[model samples]
Target chain A: QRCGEQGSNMECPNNLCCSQYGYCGMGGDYCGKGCQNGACWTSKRCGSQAGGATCTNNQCCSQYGYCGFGAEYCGAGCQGGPCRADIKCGSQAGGKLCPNNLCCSQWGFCGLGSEFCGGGCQSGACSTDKPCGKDAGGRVCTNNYCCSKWGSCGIGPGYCGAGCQSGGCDG
Target chain B: QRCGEQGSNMECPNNLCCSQYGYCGMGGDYCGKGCQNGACWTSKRCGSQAGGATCTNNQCCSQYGYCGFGAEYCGAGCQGGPCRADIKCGSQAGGKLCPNNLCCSQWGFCGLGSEFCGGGCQSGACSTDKPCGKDAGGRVCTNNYCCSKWGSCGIGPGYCGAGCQSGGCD
Candidate 1:
């Protein structure tokens, strides 16, 4: 509680990972990377990328052939050891964009290949069919929707009210 | 650099939280419930359960009306903040159990209800699932696993061979 500052007169509890951001807690955010002091967590790649190695510190190894926390290493494709639990993305998620930089499909999925970005692709190099309001050629939307100022066809005010380019513009 | 031991010896390199376990890290496992020194983490609900409030520490807030990291709070279902990235569980997980008491279903999923744990439950209050070698019944293992003197289950030579108390010993 409010320790470690100036004179380095204090610190968080023992066995705790002191972050470079001047705060303390438990889990990957506090121990994965950028840890300033205390038991910095990084699983046994041990100290590097050696096979069947183990970290002498208190952490785990991820599939990336390294040791750390968070999605970049310990998410769905985690190879061995303890892993994190959640990764949010896309419209259906309540969040957006995958941490690993995969496609955020329109329905609510994050991955690569056509299966994840085939139909109604949302983020990440979506199909060109939905590039309605964005084109200078003045093409209308496929579903008779309104063109949003930010480009894209929809039925709401932000889509059909002001800045409505084509299709269904409100009077 | 260490701190908060023996009348507080040398502190961490400033701005670092000290863990109660004598080691320090940056996530929930370190600056979480047992922080003894440095800046303890907590988000908007920093001080308490009061909303719209802010914490004085340098940590982030999880959805559990508190601030933390790792799987217990900052994974999926996070309200409006950063979340941990992974959660290993079950056979496919190379690990076991759901931290929030959820079932570790046999298929490597961690969740609740029949769809998640109804089939081949592996851990976490599953349908009479057995683990290790410390059971009341003297039944051996189907996979011919070894029973260590310390009551562990494995198939390695160190476990299934030397000092093997029971099971498929070489």
Candidate 2:
């Protein structure tokens, strides 16, 4: 129940405490200094107004009030949040969602291009679903196809020499 | 004299022509047609309506109709104006004017550093006549003085270190 909600008996959300005023919150102001009717939840919750709350999912609650599974939450300025956890990239390791069109590398990081997807791409699948065309997403062409500056696709030196993209020239 | 004042004609200033309509101007329209009463200047005048006007003294008549000794006037797109002159450093070469409080260098440019004013300063004068300490005209210091970030000047490392302005250390 929310603050100031009146009831003889009340049930609050997970990890939240029920106060003497029959409202839901956390800490001494709500849990202590009041002879209350309903029960205060046991397991800790992070990102509260007062302090001393914890996270259960092994993910870090960042100072900016969010539950993220990456270095942006674990590293620097992570004050008053959940403890750090051993986060991995792929779904087999608690399923950290990589951005769309990016490959999750063997070392558990997200990126695009050949360095991230080629050779050592384990755990996560490398994307090979780009459209084969003259120009799309700043890439001139897909696979080994040649691209021209005047928006034409072919397989000759006239088409591939200068403005070639996605892969190398055919000849 | 007033325009169209008859019989007793009063002369206009030097380099300015008495127009046919009895006014003082520089264009062919003022000096040419029906100009019988007053004196009309013969030499081509700069900043006139016609595009063929030329300038002497190594100056260029700009496209906006003004005579100035600068590359903005002499260099490319100087159409119908005088032929370009060989510009160099100093007033003897009729060089362009540098920005205020910045020393005009021997290489005919405007700046406030020691590389621009010291060592090879043969032609132009450094603007060393500025007031000492603090900021002025958007620059921290003028002349050869160093200026600090907090808007003060001295010969110590506090002023001559990072955020030093006008010149180099000391």
Please give, for every candidate in the order listed, the TM-score of chain B alone compared with the true chain B.
0.31, 0.21
| Residue range B11-68, candidate 1, lDDT tens digits | 3332234566644333233344665543343222532356534222222244455543
- Cα error, residue B68 of model 2, in Å, equals 55
Assess candidate 2 and give its lDDT.
0.36
DockQ of 1: 0.04
The runs of at least 3 residues in candidate 2 whose Cα sits more than 4 Å from the true structure, single-residue gaps closed, are A1-86, A93-95, A99-102, A106-115, A120-171, B1-170
Q: Tell me the DockQ of each model, to 2 decimals.
A: 0.04, 0.01
* RMSD to truth, every model: 22.0, 32.7
Docking class of 2: incorrect
TM-score of each: 0.24, 0.18
Q: Report how far off residue B76 is in candidate 1 (Å).
A: 3.5
